[PDB]
Structure formats: structure tokens, C-alpha cells
Design a protein around this ligand. Sequence first.
Ligand SMILES: *[C@H]1O[C@H](CO)[C@H](O)[C@H](O)[C@H]1NC(C)=O
Ligand SMILES: [Mg+2]
Ligand SMILES: [Mg+2]
Ligand SMILES: [Mg+2]
Ligand SMILES: [Mg+2]
Ligand SMILES: [Mg+2]
Ligand SMILES: [Mg+2]
Ligand SMILES: [Mg+2]
Ligand SMILES: [Mg+2]
Ligand SMILES: [Mg+2]
Ligand SMILES: [Mg+2]
Ligand SMILES: [Mg+2]
Ligand SMILES: [Mg+2]
Ligand SMILES: [Mg+2]
Ligand SMILES: [Mg+2]
Ligand SMILES: [Mg+2]
Ligand SMILES: [Mg+2]
Ligand SMILES: [Mg+2]
Ligand SMILES: [Mg+2]
Ligand SMILES: [Mg+2]
Ligand SMILES: [Mg+2]
Ligand SMILES: [Mg+2]
Ligand SMILES: [Mg+2]
Ligand SMILES: [Mg+2]
Ligand SMILES: [Mg+2]
Ligand SMILES: [Mg+2]
Ligand SMILES: [Mg+2]
Ligand SMILES: [Mg+2]
Ligand SMILES: [Mg+2]
Ligand SMILES: [Mg+2]
Ligand SMILES: [Mg+2]
Ligand SMILES: [Mg+2]
Ligand SMILES: [Mg+2]
Ligand SMILES: [Mg+2]
Ligand SMILES: [Mg+2]
Ligand SMILES: [Mg+2]
Ligand SMILES: [Mg+2]
Ligand SMILES: [Mg+2]
Ligand SMILES: [Mg+2]
Ligand SMILES: [Mg+2]
Ligand SMILES: [Mg+2]
Ligand SMILES: [Mg+2]
Lengths: 117, 144, 19, 201, 64
Amino acid sequence: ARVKRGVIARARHKKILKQAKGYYGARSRVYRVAFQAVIKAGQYAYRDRRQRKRQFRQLWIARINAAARQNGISYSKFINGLKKASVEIDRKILADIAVFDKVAFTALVEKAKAALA
Amino acid sequence: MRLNTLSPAEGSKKAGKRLGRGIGSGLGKTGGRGHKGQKSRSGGGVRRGFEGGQMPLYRRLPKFGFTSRKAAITAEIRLSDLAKVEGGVVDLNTLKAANIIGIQIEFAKVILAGEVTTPVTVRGLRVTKGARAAIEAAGGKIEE
Amino acid sequence: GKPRPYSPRPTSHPRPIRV
Amino acid sequence: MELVLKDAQSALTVSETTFGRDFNEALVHQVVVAYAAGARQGTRAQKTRAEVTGSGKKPWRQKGTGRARSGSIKSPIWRSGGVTFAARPQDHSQKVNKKMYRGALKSILSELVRQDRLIVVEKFSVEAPKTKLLAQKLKDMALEDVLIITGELDENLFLAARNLHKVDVRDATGIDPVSLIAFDKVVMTADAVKQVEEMLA
Amino acid sequence: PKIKTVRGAAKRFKKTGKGGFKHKHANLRHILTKKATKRKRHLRPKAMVSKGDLGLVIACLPYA
RNA sequence: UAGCGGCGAGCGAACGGGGAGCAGCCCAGAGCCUGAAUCAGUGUGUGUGUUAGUGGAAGCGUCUGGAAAGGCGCGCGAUACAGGGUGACAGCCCCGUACACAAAAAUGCACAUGCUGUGAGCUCGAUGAGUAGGGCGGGACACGUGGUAUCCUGUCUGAAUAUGGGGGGACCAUCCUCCAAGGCUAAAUACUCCUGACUGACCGAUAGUGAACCAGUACCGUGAGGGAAAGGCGAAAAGAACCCCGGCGAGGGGAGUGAAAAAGAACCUGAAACCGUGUACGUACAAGCAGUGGGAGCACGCUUAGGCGUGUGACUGCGUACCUUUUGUAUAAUGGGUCAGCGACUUAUAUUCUGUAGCAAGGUUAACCGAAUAGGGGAGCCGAAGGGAAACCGAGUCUUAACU
Ligand SMILES: *[C@H]1O[C@H](CO)[C@H](O)[C@H](O)[C@H]1NC(C)=O
Ligand SMILES: [Mg+2]
Ligand SMILES: [Mg+2]
Ligand SMILES: [Mg+2]
Ligand SMILES: [Mg+2]
Ligand SMILES: [Mg+2]
Ligand SMILES: [Mg+2]
Ligand SMILES: [Mg+2]
Ligand SMILES: [Mg+2]
Ligand SMILES: [Mg+2]
Ligand SMILES: [Mg+2]
Ligand SMILES: [Mg+2]
Ligand SMILES: [Mg+2]
Ligand SMILES: [Mg+2]
Ligand SMILES: [Mg+2]
Ligand SMILES: [Mg+2]
Ligand SMILES: [Mg+2]
Ligand SMILES: [Mg+2]
Ligand SMILES: [Mg+2]
Ligand SMILES: [Mg+2]
Ligand SMILES: [Mg+2]
Ligand SMILES: [Mg+2]
Ligand SMILES: [Mg+2]
Ligand SMILES: [Mg+2]
Ligand SMILES: [Mg+2]
Ligand SMILES: [Mg+2]
Ligand SMILES: [Mg+2]
Ligand SMILES: [Mg+2]
Ligand SMILES: [Mg+2]
Ligand SMILES: [Mg+2]
Ligand SMILES: [Mg+2]
Ligand SMILES: [Mg+2]
Ligand SMILES: [Mg+2]
Ligand SMILES: [Mg+2]
Ligand SMILES: [Mg+2]
Ligand SMILES: [Mg+2]
Ligand SMILES: [Mg+2]
Ligand SMILES: [Mg+2]
Ligand SMILES: [Mg+2]
Ligand SMILES: [Mg+2]
Ligand SMILES: [Mg+2]
Ligand SMILES: [Mg+2]
């Protein structure tokens, strides 16, 4: 019983070549180079699902620090203030309010300022 | 019960190791042989008893004893055998008809192994003290 | 595929002797 | 245990030990597989690097060429080379213990009764060696795919069946386990059941 | 083909009842005068192959 | 296993048992009776193979389709539903197949029967000499000179001869058994360049033969010798009349054939590397494994006219390939120009352990017989008892004069 590898090997290589679409040069044409590239894309994707959470929190904090300093308080005081006043709205929402509802954000900054007073 | 509904018992057909068929399988690359040295090589491995050059155990221990040609033609008969013979007269050649001792055996000996429960007449065999008791205890008659 | 290799041909320069 | 005859409308006593026991699927499997393996011819071969036609001349010198070192044009790495582990003719036959073979027959017959597939009659023959007659007899008795086990193999019934691919006709000595399972219905003559009983004990 | 016994091992080891091996002690062949009688006496009786060595011995004696 | 063995590596019987097959004879000599057994050769009939061959059953309608053997419907043959072919898959269209027949001629085989030689049977003998054996050197015996029987003989020797001689593993005695120094002999056994038939959990064009093809060819080598590559139009050539561009070209466009010509002979399918044309988006102030996470803008397609999908990806965080080998590799250590195909833990027999199945103090057969995957065959093998170097003893035994 002899097994020709043709059909199965063809399909394995196509599987990998399809995942390499959009890559530059040999990286989207050449199995040996596409495979390495598809693995490394995988490794980055895994690593970056974590980094995405770090990068967004960092962004949110920057925006809350802007909006708070506009209202005459640092991010560090403000967040400390929000904890003493027992407010639990998370940085993703604070940042979203800082952009979209500047009245509401001032309210939150006053509640912060009150707790520290 | 059709030809496409018979299955083997669970655990009867373990699938063989296939070496050097990729990472997933856990036997890829080196195929369980590890890295380099004699044991990793095709046709590699030292011979039986080899200890790296140290005088091997089967050569630093003295030879002893000799083989008896007599032992080879000496059989032991269990009490459980005495019943299996045809005639109740356990001769040397009735034991051979019974397939109890081998054709080349010249000296048999009945030993206290199993329970004899019939009147049996042991002729021209050696018999152990324990055996003699047990055969006599069942009405048996031991004669030289 | 690859062609069968050539037998030794004349060399333009000696290999430098590190010794 | 009683097998009712459909032709004469009566009963026939058989051993519970041969037609009564539970179905040991594992044991039947081992015996069905062993039977298939016993049918294999095992006739093939490839050529090793030893057997392929060519010289033992080293294709090029060991060092200096800039190519992968080579030793034989017959290397299994090379196009036209030997097969690394070339097949030889094999015997695929397995040993089946006598008792395990008989065990499996008893399990299969006992199943052929429980699934109403063992149709026992008293007398099953045809008049002349004519396929038209047996085909007619089988449509009346109301079965297409059938194994017919008779006492002594009647020349006429042998010849009649020969050209009906769904129908096989054997003597009791000639029951194999695969045929007992392969066929939809098994028609045994009372005479044959006696022999199959005597044969299996 | 049948495994072949290492015939030298077959002369040094006998299989016992529970499946161990007995063997004769070394050091009782010659140079005896200088050895304590106590030492020699303890070398006379046969001895059992140690756990470490069993594997080697078993390999040598497949038909023991 | 017993043995052999730098007692190393390894080498490895026999006796005895089960089977297949079975077959005994002649000369060393003379007479009697005779030429009578049996082998061959040689013709002559007889059967029966072989080398050509003969017959050999049974189907129509309709649907799809280029074509029906396919679907549906209703029939028929089968001692023939092996197999092959036929415009797709045919028991009934063709060739066959089952089965039944056939030989002028030559020839194999078997008996039968003439002919030629061949010589049976009985009696009284005879009973293989430079031999057996020896010494020296080698070799063969499972057996390496060993305590080494036995066989063979290069060398040197050298009996007895049936009241005798050979062997029984140094050797001697006893006993047993056989009769060397002359020869013939069927079957069971080995093999396949080759012929026929049949079969395959064998290959299907980088496989299988080196060789599917005009291959031991082309080609290479002074020569021995080495040694490729290369299969597929279509059912049928219907293999493209004629016209047009072109060099009375190559090549192409029409036309026509065809089910199909993007089946047009550079011909089934027609992958990938690789090379182009076209469209969308991006890209000429911008630094690095080229991705990834974030993400504007643009283009497109949708079913809220709306988000959603698709393409692109300015800008921005993070980010030094893979394999191998290593204490450790972005390493400036190894290996890979790329793609496609092939390319490495097998097989046999032993042995042990695990799982599983059967049977269980038992289990199981080998060769072989059997048309038998059955059934027979228990020769054997493993187990149910060990201890001891062994004799031997034995649920004990060894140790020791004896064991607390
Ligand atoms: C070339 O190198 C070879 C060795 O490969 C010899 O040394 C030869 O002599 C060289 N020739 C020159 C010109 O140096
Ligand atoms: Mg194939
Ligand atoms: Mg592409
Ligand atoms: Mg691992
Ligand atoms: Mg390595
Ligand atoms: Mg190392
Ligand atoms: Mg190692
Ligand atoms: Mg090798
Ligand atoms: Mg040393
Ligand atoms: Mg026996
Ligand atoms: Mg290549
Ligand atoms: Mg080949
Ligand atoms: Mg059998
Ligand atoms: Mg000593
Ligand atoms: Mg016909
Ligand atoms: Mg039709
Ligand atoms: Mg077609
Ligand atoms: Mg003589
Ligand atoms: Mg002699
Ligand atoms: Mg001589
Ligand atoms: Mg001599
Ligand atoms: Mg002698
Ligand atoms: Mg006698
Ligand atoms: Mg080829
Ligand atoms: Mg092809
Ligand atoms: Mg030439
Ligand atoms: Mg033209
Ligand atoms: Mg076609
Ligand atoms: Mg094509
Ligand atoms: Mg392409
Ligand atoms: Mg600038
Ligand atoms: Mg710019
Ligand atoms: Mg640059
Ligand atoms: Mg970076
Ligand atoms: Mg280093
Ligand atoms: Mg690093
Ligand atoms: Mg470096
Ligand atoms: Mg590198
Ligand atoms: Mg570099
Ligand atoms: Mg290196
Ligand atoms: Mg390189
Ligand atoms: Mg014992």
C-alpha cells in the first residue's frame, strides 16, 4: 500500500499561504518563508492580546490626566479622591466621559475634590 | 452482528509508536533516542553484559559446578499424576504411556505434591517419606 | 536537480597556509 | 432449547451450549479478523538499495566538489534509488486457538438465533441442476441473500446456486465464521444442525 | 532466530525459586594463605545477585 | 540444551521422538540346470494428454444525454453474473464464460503384444592389503590438542585376514553390536533462463524492471565497464476545405469538425515556484526580521441608508528569521535560491513485560494429513516443587560431626 503525499501536502501548504495573504514578497508566495511569518504573526498576536490591555489603560489614564488637570487636579489626587468618595467607575468609562460629557466629568472631579477636602 | 459492527475489546489494540513524525506526537526529531552518543546511532548499542570496559559481572565471578547427565533422565511425579495413569499400576512405562514423564527418563520419584484419592500400586519407583504415607493412606501398595 | 560535479581542474591561487 | 422448522412445522432440540450462549463480541472480532488475515496472499516486494540495478561506484569523490557526499546511485534518498524498507512476501496468517475458534462459532450461531437469521428446515434440495428452480424456491421461502448449510452437499443444489451471487451452498464441515455473519439469513438442514452440534460439542 | 545464551554467564549463575540468581563468591580461588579464615568461610556459601546486577544477568540468560 | 571457546566475542551438536518418502540389488566364481526373472532399445495395436479448432443461453420501451450499458417501467437466461470490449456503469449488443464436442500429421505418457539383446533359480564356494592400525604434519568432525574418541591424508611405516577384524568419545577388561579396504540404486529434496493458466489489503509513469516509449538504446569511456530521459487529442481524425494578415514563412484571426478546440497535435486534468496585463488603495522628509496591537482616510458590495462585510493601510506601541548545535546564538556559528514530487525507527524470528481474549491446574500444539482458514496430529513446549556442584533428598533441602 503506497501513499502519494501530493493532495494532502498541497492542502497543508495552501492553509499556511492563505494565512500569509498581505505579507511582503516571499512572505506571501514561498511556503518556507510564509510558514515562519505565519508562526511569528501568531506569537505577536498572543503577546499583543496582553499588550492591548496595557496600551488602552495607559491611553485612558493619559486622557483622565488631561481632563482632570483642566478641572484643576492631577490624575493621582483625582483617582485617590474617587476611592475616598467610594466611586467605582473604571478608567475606560472615566476616559470616555472626559471626552464625551465634560459636565459629568467636572461633577466627578468635584466629588473627588470633596472627599480630599 | 454484521461485518461492519464487530469492534475489538477496549485496551486490546494499543497503536504503535511512530517516531520522527513531528513535534505534536512527542517522538519527533530524535525519536526518543536523545542527543548523539552510541545509543542514538542506527545499529547503535553495546552488547549484553557490557559495562563500559569494567570486567563484567559474568566474568569477575568464578564458574562453579558441573551438569549431571543423570539429572536429565530423572523425573519427579506428583500424587495428582498417579490417578491419570490407566490400570492403577504406576510403573515407569505406564507413566510414559500417560505422558507424565518423558520417553528418555530412566528414574522417576513420587513426591508429596497434590492429593492421591485412589488405591494405586507404585512399582519400581523411588517414593518420598511424605508420598509413601499418602499412597498407603489411600490403600496403595509401594513395591521395589 | 544538479549536474554531476567536475573532476579537479587547475586552481588560479594556492590556499593560504595557516601553519 | 428448541429450533422450530418452517418447512414441516415441528421442533428440533439443540444444546444451549452451542445455540444459547451470550455474544462474546471481542472473541468473534479476533476470529473474524484472523479469518480475513488468513485470506491475504502477501505476494509483493520492492527493491532495497542492494537489489536495484546499478554499480557500487561512488558517484563523485568524498570531498572538494561542493556537493552533498554520495556513496551509491541506489541510495533511497535518490530518484531511482532503493526503497528504504522494501517489502518482502509476508505470511499474514494468525494462530487462532481451537477453543477460541469454536467459542466464536458458538457466539455467532447463538446470535443467528437471537436475530431470527438461522432459518432451520428438515429437507432443502431442488429437482434438476437448474438455477431457475432454486431462484423460485428462494422467492417462495421469502429470502434473497442466504447461506444454505446442508448435511451432504447435493451436486444439483451446488450447481443451481453457483450462478446466484447472493446465495452460497456449503456442507456443515465448511461453515466459516465470516460467511455465518456476512449472509442476511442462514438456512441449516436439521441433518446439518446435528453435525454442527456434534462438530462444536 | 533464537536468542543465544551468554554461555559464560550460564556457568556462573543458577536461577533460584523466586526467580533470583545464585552465584559463587569471588576472591576464593588463590592467594588464600594471607586471607583470614573468617573471610574465606564467609566466601564459601553461594550468594544472590544484587538488585543492581539483575538486569545485566537477565539479559545474558534469556532461557534461565 | 550438551559441549566447544583469548571459556572472550561467538560457535553449537547428538541420542531420542513426531512426520514426508520408502527398495533393494550386483561383482570379487565354478558347476548344474538352462537361458525361464527384470531391466532397456525396437516396431505394432490400444486407451489417454499435447500441438490448430467447433457449438455455446437470454431485452425491449421510455427519460436524461454528444452518445446509454445510467434513471424509470415491464420481460427473459443462468451447470454461463469469470473477464474483456462496445460513444457514460451491459448476465441477455460483441468476444467470451459454464457446459458439450474436435485431429490428416507429429509427438509425450501409460498399459498390452511380437522382435532383439539382457540373463533367473538351486548347490558348493569365495568374502576387496601398501589396506586397517601406527609415527610426524595438516585438515574435517558443534568439539580451537585438549584427558580427545571418530573421519581424511602430505610424509614415513604397516597387520590380522571369521579360530579374524571395526565400533561403543582417553584407555583397559567384560559384554553388545557391526563386517572397512569393489560398485549400482526410484521416491520424499533443491532450482526457474523458459511455456501456459490463474491470483494479489503489490506499483500506477520521480512508482513498478535500468527499460510501459524502437533501452541495455542515446550518450560516456581506449577498454572492462557505465548508462539515461521520454506514456495519455477525441467515442470516431470528423487531424481544421475555404478566406484573411504574413516572407508562396513562422505565428495568428475567421470558417468548419466535434459534446467540448481555453480537446488543434508544443493536444486529458492542468497545482506551485516564476513572469506579465488590468483595476482599487497605499507610497518620493523616510531608517532596521517587514509582522503584530492600535488606527484615520479612500474604494467597493450589501438587507436600517444604515451599520455590517471586503480591499487598501497614512500615523502610532511593541517587535533582532527558521533549523541545528550548544553553558549560551539576531548572531558575524551550521544548513536551506525558490517551488513541486520523492526522502529516514522497518521486517523476520526469538525473548521479556503490559493490555486484551480464550481456557484454567492446566494451557497449547509443530511438521504433517486433510480439497478443506474446518477437522485430525499432543511429537513436543510452558506450568503445577524446591534444595544441592553432585549423588541424592524432597515441602523441604543445603551447610556442618551437629545446628539453638
Ligand atoms: C591551485 O591549488 C591547488 C590545490 O588545490 C594547487 O596548490 C595548485 O598548485 C594551485 N595553483 C596555483 C596557481 O596556486
Ligand atoms: Mg495506488
Ligand atoms: Mg499568490
Ligand atoms: Mg519530549
Ligand atoms: Mg542532531
Ligand atoms: Mg553530548
Ligand atoms: Mg544518549
Ligand atoms: Mg549503518
Ligand atoms: Mg582495562
Ligand atoms: Mg509426551
Ligand atoms: Mg532540489
Ligand atoms: Mg525502483
Ligand atoms: Mg488446526
Ligand atoms: Mg580452588
Ligand atoms: Mg453467445
Ligand atoms: Mg434505458
Ligand atoms: Mg465520459
Ligand atoms: Mg569385506
Ligand atoms: Mg578406523
Ligand atoms: Mg590411516
Ligand atoms: Mg590414533
Ligand atoms: Mg575404540
Ligand atoms: Mg541383541
Ligand atoms: Mg521508470
Ligand atoms: Mg502524471
Ligand atoms: Mg566508443
Ligand atoms: Mg499556418
Ligand atoms: Mg475521456
Ligand atoms: Mg492540457
Ligand atoms: Mg499558475
Ligand atoms: Mg527632516
Ligand atoms: Mg510624504
Ligand atoms: Mg530603508
Ligand atoms: Mg521597535
Ligand atoms: Mg562554544
Ligand atoms: Mg538573544
Ligand atoms: Mg556574534
Ligand atoms: Mg547565520
Ligand atoms: Mg547579516
Ligand atoms: Mg560545525
Ligand atoms: Mg548556505
Ligand atoms: Mg527440582
